[PDB]
């Protein structure tokens, strides 16, 4: 799989990561239930190129 190093070499908001809230933040904020409002799925959602 041939990635021209703008997506695989720079890693972050360009082909990296989709993660839940860290567990210690959920305890600290005492939140009733704490979600990531930007969660997506590889199969249903779409990632820009």
């Amino acid at each position: 799989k041939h990635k021209s190093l703008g997506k695989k070499l720079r890693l972050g908001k360009a082909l990296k990561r989709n993660s839940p809230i860290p567990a210690w933040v959920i305890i600290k904020t005492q939140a009733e239930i704490r979600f990531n409002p930007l969660r997506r799925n590889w199969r249903r959602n779409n990632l820009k190129v």
Binding site: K8, L9, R10, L11, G12, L15, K16, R17
Partner: protein, 81 residues
């Protein structure tokens, strides 16, 4: 320049079996000197260097020492083992 030393379960097996170290370095992409950065910081000799870029924003090097030196002593000095 060196950033961290990787001590996962794959990294531990390579120290004991292949005499290699696994480090995370800056990805400055004009590389001649990871060889002489470790040869200066730890006073060892390097035989081979194989480098990699992980999918989560890191550059990982597999530096293999010469038979006269043990990668266990370098790891033990850092406290990995």
């Amino acid at each position: 320049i060196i950033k961290e030393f990787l001590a996962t379960e794959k990294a531990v097996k390579l120290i004991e079996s292949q005499n290699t170290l696994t480090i995370i370095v800056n990805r400055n992409t004009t590389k001649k000197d990871i060889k002489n950065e470790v040869e200066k910081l730890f006073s060892v000799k390097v035989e081979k260097i194989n480098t990699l870029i992980t999918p989560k924003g890191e550059k990982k090097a597999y530096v293999k020492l010469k038979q006269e030196y043990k990668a266990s002593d370098v790891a033990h000095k850092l406290g990995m083992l």
